């Protein structure tokens, strides 16, 4: 979807309606906590809107051209066994970004940081809207500097006509009730989002592609924006319940993957061009290292980088992981010290490590974070 850096545009509309939807569908016997947390979200509407649009303008990433179009099965494929050379981190997908930002949002809300939490939530919804955008050609045709395409700008000038204010039922009915059943947030999200994304892919072939008429486009925008709004409301509903009832999705399950959200200091020369690795050591002495690499320029000054690591051993619990570290290895003979500001590690939907560092890492050395 289209959006603007000031928090306006299609993305912001979706997220704004996501709240109205909840405002009207929330049944009477819903817990006060859910109801009062919704009020806190509404009071931070602007932040929700800024988060909803920010990913298309984020300048603290990898200095690459934005493109938010993936095949709906990408995440599922990357999850299968064998289908990936484990020494390499897994690429970021909209599907995985929903989970990352949702985890960051929950962690922040529980520590009282509502503004930061809302922003992160908005970012999670931005990616859900994307996978719900019916645009799936092999070759993309960008029309602006933010990587948007013509279908999105077409929907943008007509966004107001596509609004909805109800999911179709009350939160005490099937749609909302089914959302709370799966205590495994990450598992639920995967199956929940694919549905919207596949329907979106189908709509692309039958209505939204460039060969279809304007009426087909208007209809495509109508049905996919309704799905996006509804789907978004469902996410926000799940979020409110998760943060209200102190719900933990990682409850006693295996850790097949770890996610690193690294904040590099804004101080001059803090970023590095040297090789960077992440590693872990179990209670039984087994170790595994991964190279943190993405298509763009990694670890830039003041950047916020993301790396997904798939484990060899799929039968380890979070507690079995004793140590965690990052390691630098010289690319050239010239100095290129690295200064990370903060490092968060996520496992099964929960922020298990939140560490401020603000220390220089030089030469070929290892910095332990746990
Ligand atoms: Zn978008
Ligand atoms: Zn986007």
Swiss-Prot record:
<feature type="binding site">
    <location>
        <position position="298"/>
    </location>
    <ligand>
        <name>Ca(2+) 2</name>
    </ligand>
</feature>
<dbReference type="InterPro" id="IPR001531">
    <property type="entry name" value="Zn_PLipaseC"/>
</dbReference>
<feature type="binding site">
    <location>
        <position position="68"/>
    </location>
    <ligand>
        <name>Zn(2+) 3</name>
    </ligand>
</feature>
<keyword id="KW-0843">Virulence</keyword>
<feature type="binding site">
    <location>
        <position position="136"/>
    </location>
    <ligand>
        <name>Zn(2+) 2</name>
    </ligand>
</feature>
<feature type="binding site">
    <location>
        <position position="152"/>
    </location>
    <ligand>
        <name>Zn(2+) 2</name>
    </ligand>
</feature>
<dbReference type="InterPro" id="IPR001024">
    <property type="entry name" value="PLAT/LH2_dom"/>
</dbReference>
<feature type="binding site">
    <location>
        <position position="1"/>
    </location>
    <ligand>
        <name>Zn(2+) 1</name>
    </ligand>
</feature>
<dbReference type="GO" id="GO:0001907">
    <property type="term" value="P:symbiont-mediated killing of host cell"/>
</dbReference>
<dbReference type="GO" id="GO:0005576">
    <property type="term" value="C:extracellular region"/>
</dbReference>
<feature type="binding site">
    <location>
        <position position="297"/>
    </location>
    <ligand>
        <name>Ca(2+) 3</name>
    </ligand>
</feature>
<protein>
    <recommendedName>
        <fullName>Phospholipase C</fullName>
        <ecNumber>3.1.4.3</ecNumber>
    </recommendedName>
</protein>
<keyword id="KW-0106">Calcium</keyword>
<feature type="binding site">
    <location>
        <position position="293"/>
    </location>
    <ligand>
        <name>Ca(2+) 2</name>
    </ligand>
</feature>
<feature type="binding site">
    <location>
        <position position="130"/>
    </location>
    <ligand>
        <name>Zn(2+) 1</name>
    </ligand>
</feature>
<dbReference type="Pfam" id="PF00882">
    <property type="entry name" value="Zn_dep_PLPC"/>
</dbReference>
<feature type="binding site">
    <location>
        <position position="130"/>
    </location>
    <ligand>
        <name>Zn(2+) 3</name>
    </ligand>
</feature>
<dbReference type="GO" id="GO:0008270">
    <property type="term" value="F:zinc ion binding"/>
</dbReference>
<keyword id="KW-0732">Signal</keyword>
<feature type="binding site">
    <location>
        <position position="11"/>
    </location>
    <ligand>
        <name>Zn(2+) 1</name>
    </ligand>
</feature>
<dbReference type="GO" id="GO:0044179">
    <property type="term" value="P:hemolysis in another organism"/>
</dbReference>
<keyword id="KW-0800">Toxin</keyword>
<comment type="function">
    <text>Bacterial hemolysins are exotoxins that attack blood cell membranes and cause cell rupture. Constitutes an essential virulence factor in gas gangrene. Binds to eukaryotic membranes where it hydrolyzes both phosphatidylcholine and sphingomyelin. The diacylglycerol produced can activate both the arachidonic acid pathway, leading to modulation of the inflammatory response cascade and thrombosis, and protein kinase C, leading to activation of eukaryotic phospholipases and further membrane damage. Acts on human and mouse erythrocytes, but not on rabbit or horse erythrocytes.</text>
</comment>
<feature type="domain" description="Zn-dependent PLC">
    <location>
        <begin position="1"/>
        <end position="250"/>
    </location>
</feature>
<feature type="binding site">
    <location>
        <position position="148"/>
    </location>
    <ligand>
        <name>Zn(2+) 2</name>
    </ligand>
</feature>
<feature type="binding site">
    <location>
        <position position="269"/>
    </location>
    <ligand>
        <name>Ca(2+) 1</name>
    </ligand>
</feature>
<keyword id="KW-0354">Hemolysis</keyword>
<keyword id="KW-0204">Cytolysis</keyword>
<comment type="similarity">
    <text>Belongs to the bacterial zinc-metallophospholipase C family.</text>
</comment>
<feature type="binding site">
    <location>
        <position position="272"/>
    </location>
    <ligand>
        <name>Ca(2+) 3</name>
    </ligand>
</feature>
<feature type="binding site">
    <location>
        <position position="336"/>
    </location>
    <ligand>
        <name>Ca(2+) 1</name>
    </ligand>
</feature>
<keyword id="KW-0862">Zinc</keyword>
<dbReference type="InterPro" id="IPR008947">
    <property type="entry name" value="PLipase_C/P1_nuclease_dom_sf"/>
</dbReference>
<dbReference type="InterPro" id="IPR029002">
    <property type="entry name" value="PLPC/GPLD1"/>
</dbReference>
<feature type="binding site">
    <location>
        <position position="273"/>
    </location>
    <ligand>
        <name>Ca(2+) 3</name>
    </ligand>
</feature>
<feature type="region of interest" description="Linker">
    <location>
        <begin position="247"/>
        <end position="255"/>
    </location>
</feature>
<feature type="domain" description="PLAT">
    <location>
        <begin position="256"/>
        <end position="370"/>
    </location>
</feature>
<feature type="binding site">
    <location>
        <position position="56"/>
    </location>
    <ligand>
        <name>Zn(2+) 3</name>
    </ligand>
</feature>
<feature type="binding site">
    <location>
        <position position="271"/>
    </location>
    <ligand>
        <name>Ca(2+) 1</name>
    </ligand>
</feature>
<dbReference type="InterPro" id="IPR036392">
    <property type="entry name" value="PLAT/LH2_dom_sf"/>
</dbReference>
<feature type="binding site">
    <location>
        <position position="337"/>
    </location>
    <ligand>
        <name>Ca(2+) 1</name>
    </ligand>
</feature>
<keyword id="KW-0378">Hydrolase</keyword>
